[PDB]
């Protein structure tokens, strides 16, 4: 899939991938998140969030503080480049962002903000 | 001390310890479980369940299947030596079991049956 | 691949894949393991081990007790269906086994036995 | 007590707590770290490093490059507020620091820099 990627977050709190690459030719980029499995969103919610590796911790810590009702993300969080909604099993969501929001020579991370999940669910995103 | 132990499961899906030792001089052993944090039982519940290491996976799988209504535990599971109720933040439980139900030379595990949790929340229990 | 799979273990304690499907038509099945990255064996050691889901905890526990010189695997562990050596970055290893060693209706896990890596490095393997 | 906290980092790559709150009335604050278990420092070393959340990634990445020889921390790292030595099992270390190096409103994290360990061995520290 050019300028896009499909990623799954399953019931074992695992994303199917740990590395995403964005082609510099891509003007925009889409990340499609699906959740195979059977567990509902309150027990095994998955969202997908992108930020520099530097801000990942603060976004997680603040996302937790915001709670369920907030999809565990601090609203208008200026550190978040892009993020999907928190989904439960069987659901799907995509988020498209401008590639110009990313510098070559900077480390980014994608990760889930549901409490405790980032330990397991995280990977790197890099321009190419 | 000695014949009882205070355990906490937090909002970051972790127990405060991963090892417990039962002195053979105890007739009974009491485990007190509290849930520091702010998240609800339906989102981040914790119980504390004891079984041989060999039966743990069955207990976790059959528990998952049982749903929130059953405290993520299969009714009358004979594999479970003991267990607390499933608790939410700001809640607590206690459970006592006769030390005679344990044998020296057998590998025992304590853990949480709330979906996905045992991956991180578990520990060893030994008769020493 | 055909009756085989290539899997990598990295410096971020992650396997590139978390679900392995073995086809019944396969007489044998090959698992190729590589460790991209730059960290050595005593620090970011990776082996790939296969056992029923029920046997995983005992294998990991006895494995931690075998020591580094034993690749953190108890020699002659009857629960281990197949395994690799413990490798560091830049190294590679593979193991092939008979598909008749697996049965329909049983749950299998693949995992790393290096101290503290199995909570993050594990996946399922199923005979289809 | 009051201006001190006991932290244990075990053989399962975890800390006993994930949140430290330092009371403003403290002039100095102590972190006593111990290491229950039996694994050695070259395989399951733990330290206790403090810095702002925004800085954690850098301290971890740079520390990971410094090596065992440097206790997995960059010498004279200007982002490190306080830190312990890297310890193996049965060892203990303590670090006391001036509370005026912390400011209200700023998010601090404590973590272990041995490669890979920060996935699970981290927590927050707040001046309250
Ligand atoms: Co999630
Ligand atoms: Co739990
Ligand atoms: Co490993
Ligand atoms: Co450590």
From Swiss-Prot, chains A, B, C, D:
Q: Name one Pfam family in it.
A: Copper-bind
Question: What InterPro entries does UniProt report for this protein, alphabetically?
Answer: Azurin (IPR014068), BlueCu_1 (IPR000923), BlueCu_1_BS (IPR028871), Cu-binding_ET (IPR050845), Cupredoxin (IPR008972)
The segment(s) forming the Plastocyanin-like domain are 1-128
Disulfide-bond pairs as recorded: 3-26
Q: Which GO terms describe its cellular component?
A: periplasmic space; plasma membrane
Q: Which UniProt keywords apply?
A: Copper, Disulfide bond, Electron transport, Metal-binding, Periplasm, Signal, Transport
The record's subcellular locations are:
Periplasm
GO MF, one term, reads: identical protein binding
Query: Record-annotated residues binding Cu cation?
Result: 46, 112, 117, 121
The organism's superkingdom is given as: Bacteria
Q: What is its main location?
A: periplasm
Q: Which PANTHER family match?
A: AURACYANIN-B (PTHR38439), OUTER MEMBRANE PROTEIN H.8 (PTHR38439:SF2)
* Role of this protein: Transfers electrons from cytochrome c551 to cytochrome oxidase.
Name of the protein in question? Azurin
UniProt organism field:
Pseudomonas aeruginosa (strain ATCC 15692 / DSM 22644 / CIP 104116 / JCM 14847 / LMG 12228 / 1C / PRS 101 / PAO1)
**Gene name as annotated:** azu
